[PDB]
Design a protein around this ligand. Sequence first.
Ligand code: NA
Length: 330
Amino acid sequence: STGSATTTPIDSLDDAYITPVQIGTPAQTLNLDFDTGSSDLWVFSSETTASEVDGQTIYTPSKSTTAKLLSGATWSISYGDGSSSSGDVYTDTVSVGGLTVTGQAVESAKKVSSSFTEDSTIDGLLGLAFSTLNTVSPTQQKTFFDNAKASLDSPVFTADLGYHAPGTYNFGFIDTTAYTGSITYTAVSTKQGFWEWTSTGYAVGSGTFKSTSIDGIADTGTTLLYLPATVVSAYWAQVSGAKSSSSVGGYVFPCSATLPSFTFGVGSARIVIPGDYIDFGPISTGSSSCFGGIQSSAGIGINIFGDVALKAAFVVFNGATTPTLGFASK
Ligand code: NA
């Protein structure tokens, strides 16, 4: 089998991407944030504290003839950005882009943190990291991909995120028309539960490539590119007036600037992030200070190749017995 679904930016900055997901019978379609940095499929629901729901579409398990309580199971998650959610668990039929999994764990939120409430466009998350990170207790549950894997034509999914435009998540096949040149594959460590890999270096603009190993995670659920402070300083030094602002919480730059590109290495190959991809706009409405899309990972404890990086590439998440990642230009 295969599946293919379009993923759509939630706003004009590409702060996140939402993908429609069919849950239950008859289908209830929710727009979920596909997150290769976590491993829980959780949704706003008829169980979510009423004051914590503000415009989201909810899953109502009592209206699904295929829903079944997963008795005794609970979940609770906290994300790198400080947000969180928790609740109980149902199994139900879940379909993405025509690919169906029966008996998928659907984690129903009883509580969500304010950042989720405040974002009316995201109805929940669909985790695509390794199932070892799934938070359900006392019986850990499998991700949608892990459940689908054996049935897929090939045990892979691909992320093709757009810049200020929709893109595509495919399951079970490589669309050879979706990228240019060849795909370069690179090794993955699953020891921390992530799609963790090692970039071979970077360049700023038209500058020389610096060969240096940068361990990090491929994370579709993180907006920005988080790299070591040395690398990030080298980038922003090429933008007149850019500076790290402790009060704003990262690098800012004059909105009048023209941003240079940023290149990262994948083996001997190179992925170029255009400068425009690094602009996250005014820090507040009407400000002439703009927020940068490349930020320091110092304090986070891991480097994160978030959407800023991933949307410059066609990315293969190869879930074979020994997983690997692939990157192509597009
Ligand atoms: Na922000």
